[PDB]
């Protein structure tokens, strides 16, 4: 943390953050969500980290070079250490990236190594080559070299993500899936795990071995698993919580803007809220059904009437303000809602649906007052506008993600937030073989458009190709875009170091500080 001259620090440097839900895991290779990544950034540090404004910056790697954007060489700082005092080496990164690639690990982020195009990843994921053939090597203890199969100019931007953080081989091998228990875990970020009580709290304490420990200010941070946004706000206002999770309750938000304006932080965020359709399950394998659902949802009602927290109605998957996004707003988005409704009804009528045999299906969402209220509104809108019946189902976060991966669903609420600020951070998740493809969408045409983006060596052709890839997804109605999120949360006046300038919201508790109050 960089405490401004003149600021008086509180005697007790502790923080309590709400984290939305119980985490899937603390193992960097078994996680895929925001709550998971929030804790992961305090515990495991990769090659690069985001600074306080979100810029990719030195993590374990103090400096790096690239040759033709294909061979990346990272020079690891000599004093990088794990919490048990042992050095973090390039060998840790080699083991870690191989474990991520290995199909036996079954990481939801196995495809992150395909997104960066590390050599031999496709064959490794497919079981054709052993994970040890991955294009990574330790040239020495302090030098990690990555070899890609094609030039990727934005490659280093990927490296702040939890999936490419190092994990400690000896703990993994000795304790297997209990390696992340407090008595066994070993970490290399600014914090160490002190306590983990499922559905109660995660307590982290400062890691004295961290290389940049002298600049850490907060001594302990607690992450809570509260999925009710109302309850989060209540425990924030009671004094327990210093920073709410960044999901805000429809019940109270308008009142909060008037009551504590200075604490209501609202900043740009590269995330899209959408209804994920299971594209491989009848009748959602019919483009007419998906298109009907996409058109009949009234975003103006949802975004401006129901939620009204500053979100913008969405017509694409990639947020339009992602760096490199130059998207074409589809003609249906300019139509009137009535015109969208007629087209929708026409398509469903063409798909075989009638008043006597209507379309009925489930709408799965992770427990939350916000998603429940939005799903109830969407259900009402779809019933009224298109004559469809939906059965709402809530599931806790970890179960909910497993259901979407399993494909044991019809339509699910969804939100994707960028991992690096570039259109492929979104677009790569709709690749037929992506480990992040919970839409179960498989388009050879879409796949080809993205493969072509690194076959050209310039940004304008690349941006036009991303635009076309979005048009292909839209043409297929793979999803139902709802809104682009804003990052809205409450932060007490005494929490310093949180700018709100990072559109990825990659917060590190090592950058924060408690102002005397
Ligand atoms: U004190
Ligand atoms: U105090
Ligand atoms: U660049
Ligand atoms: U950029
Ligand atoms: U269903
Ligand atoms: U509620
Ligand atoms: U470039
Ligand atoms: U105080």
UniProtKB/Swiss-Prot annotation:
Entry keyword annotation includes Manganese: no
Gene3D superfamilies (UniProt xref): Dipeptide-binding Protein, Domain 1 (3.90.76.10), Dipeptide-binding Protein, Domain 3 (3.10.105.10), Periplasmic binding protein-like II (3.40.190.10)
Subcellular location, principal: periplasm
InterPro entries hit by this protein: Peptide/Ni-bd, SBP_5, SBP_5_CS, SBP_5_dom
Family label: Belongs to the bacterial solute-binding protein 5 family.
PANTHER family: PERIPLASMIC BINDING COMPONENT OF ABC TRANSPORTER, PERIPLASMIC OLIGOPEPTIDE-BINDING PROTEIN-RELATED
Keyword Disulfide bond on entry: yes
Induction: Part of the opp operon, which is constitutively expressed.
Name of the protein described by the UniProt record: Periplasmic oligopeptide-binding protein OppA
Disulfide cross-links: 271-417
GO molecular-function terms, A-Z: peptide transmembrane transporter activity
Matching SUPFAM superfamilies: Periplasmic binding protein-like II
Miscellaneous note of the record: Isothermal titration calorimetric measurements of the binding of lysine-containing peptides of different lengths to OppA show that the dipeptide Lys-Lys is bound with 60-fold lower affinity than related tri- and tetrapeptides (Lys-Lys-Lys and Lys-Lys-Lys-Ala, respectively).
Knocked-out gene: effects: Mutant cannot take up cell wall peptides.
Location in or out of the cell: Periplasm
Keywords, in A-Z order: Disulfide bond, Peptide transport, Periplasm, Protein transport, Signal, Transport
GO terms under cellular component: ATP-binding cassette (ABC) transporter complex; outer membrane-bounded periplasmic space
Source organism of this protein record: Salmonella typhimurium (strain LT2 / SGSC1412 / ATCC 700720)
GO biological process: peptide transport; protein transport
Subunit structure, interactors included: The complex is composed of two ATP-binding proteins (OppD and OppF), two transmembrane proteins (OppB and OppC) and a solute-binding protein (OppA).
Function (record text): Part of the ABC transporter complex OppABCDF involved in the uptake of oligopeptides, including the cell wall murein tripeptide L-alanyl-gamma-D-glutamyl-meso-diaminopimelate. Plays an important nutritional role and is involved in the recycling of cell wall peptides. Binds peptides containing from two to five amino acid residues regardless of their sequence. Also binds cell wall peptides, such as L-alanyl-gamma-D-glutamyl-meso-diaminopimelate.
Description of its domains: Accommodates the ligand side chains in large hydrated pockets which impose little specificity on binding. Tight binding is achieved by utilising the hydrogen-bonding potential of the main chain of the ligand.
